């Protein structure tokens, strides 16, 4: 509740906030869904202004073709953050962030469910494909 | 089977539940297709034998409520266990820690399979 | 976006040998299947060696004529049978806490991956399934 959003963007607005908690600087991925998908890059174009608002250096509008930013919290399965070596004491904090991050993936699965088809009582995709 | 549907005759209340839960407020239980009525625990429903919802008393099916769809919703924010500096671990705990985060996963796949399905 | 643990290689005539990039925890957690008229599942110790750590030497040389168009494989981690279970000590090992955290990292990932895998946004909606019945043309 809720990882994936889309805002609304028009030009000269560049400061958009994150509702979730991110747990690592790279886990936010920021894509102007636009007409077409475009992934944005951690320093070139958006900087985290206050750890909870994403500033934008370039203030994109609909007029160069793009609405809107979709920011999900993609959490990698391979880049695990907590590794237990031979001791190397277990702080409780180590065991905490290990069970914290794996819940973060599991909840990201529950906001994947809204962004495929949906039943309206089915979607405005231009294509469905390979049959 | 993290979510199941239960329609039944009226003034009966002794539903059995499997999935199996961790906290009693994870079971959310609903009233159906005319409305989306979500009833609360202590105004309405206890659990009696820790596997039955024993409901409240009647409702069914007559008030447009045909009928109950109880389900798991585990909260992903309120972790049941916070590990602290020792404050020693119990082996029950080290399991239940990883047990809960596997249950969001079993929850998450199954409501996606209810739209267009796999099989 | 993007599927990390289900993958569909082009079977492409006689090619015996494909790679598996994701971090499968045990041998039996990878199920390989055959696509193209059927959904053929093929058992390990006879029909295909694990070539190496990361490679499936499939024996032999299926498709596409004589039936199957794409070898695909996915992870299936058992979400019930946990792999190391902690009892009273029984000292905590680095291997024990990791594999326990490794496994539940997969089950949440295998969930999130499976949810795109059914019908979901291609990087438009996708997959080579039959989309069995919708029952009316309007």
Author numbering:
A (entry chain b): 5 to 125, 129 to 138
B (entry chain c): 6 to 124
C (entry chain a): 3 to 125, 129 to 143
Give passages from the manuscript.
The phages package genomic dsDNA into a round procapsid using the portal in complex with an ATP-dependent terminase complex as the motor.
Six trimers of the tail fiber gp17 N-termini anchoring to the adaptor-portal interface were clearly resolved. Each gp17 N-terminus is formed by a jelly-roll barrel and a 22-residue α-helix.
